[PDB]
Design a protein around this nucleic acid. Sequence first.
DNA 1: GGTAGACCTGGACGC
DNA 2: GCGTCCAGGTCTACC
Length: 314
Amino acid sequence: SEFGHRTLASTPALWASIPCPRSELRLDLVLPSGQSFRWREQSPAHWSGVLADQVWTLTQTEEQLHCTVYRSQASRPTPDELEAVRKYFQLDVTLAQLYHHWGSVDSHFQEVAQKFQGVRLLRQDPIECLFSFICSSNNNIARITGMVERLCQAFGPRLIQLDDVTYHGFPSLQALAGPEVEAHLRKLGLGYRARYVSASARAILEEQGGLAWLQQLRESSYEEAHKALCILPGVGTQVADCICLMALDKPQAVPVDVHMWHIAQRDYSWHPTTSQAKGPCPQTNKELGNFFRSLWGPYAGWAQAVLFSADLRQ
DNA sequence: GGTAGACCTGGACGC
DNA sequence: GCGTCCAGGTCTACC
Ligand SMILES: [Ca+2]
Ligand SMILES: [Ca+2]
């Protein structure tokens, strides 16, 4: 059937593969784990979302990542298009190599890694990432996903409709900086997060020099970027870290939330040295991050992603 | 320079 | 049925 969301079984001719063993990627451990909030499993084992300003559905077999795009006559994805997918999942970095290293220097990680393979990091767009995580604070993944959806529906470009689901592209700075955006987001249920989105959009545009400012941060240092991001309304060290790690190519940035905070205590018997605070404080959180960085190396952020993901289930 | 509440929302959760 | 607790925290007003 030419309608609704596709499935590998339903329309074989429209799918193309990317060699990728499950040990290098587990869609179900990555897509709904709080990295990106734009993917839904519309059909069992099939994930649909907007990627590179187009709609896709992904599914995998033992050794293959099957992809299908919705753009003209319906046809399988092209090599170039497939490359978009590869870049998005940063498939050039070998998860096996990282897992080996982390596992060799951390027994606990080895134990977790034995049951949660294929958890890698997505390379996300700076804008989409920055605003998605501004919506993530003092909130749960289920709700956050809804908020980002209505945000895109209300201020993003309409892409294509599958069944009764209409996909939108992520809003632009100009749209987010638009008049009365906050009031609207409020009526959309983003709570006090509403003002953050408007204020941060207006600030990057009317004070930091626009989109270029954000993108330039990808070349800047982690210390650099993190400091820069913390300027924006609604962006603290934790949100700043999420953005550095997932969108600004800072693989050593380690987001420290409640999850990573309980993980450090329960799994590593970790306690603040540079402080005596009772809960995650700006100083203790800073210290935990260094701890993890010192324990896992240059890709500590990625190691964190595996544990955060695993903790969402366990 | 460490440190207590105050938020929007809405699934649990225990009562 | 229903107040509490809490989730990928940030912001800010006393110490
Ligand atoms: Ca909390
Ligand atoms: Ca800030």
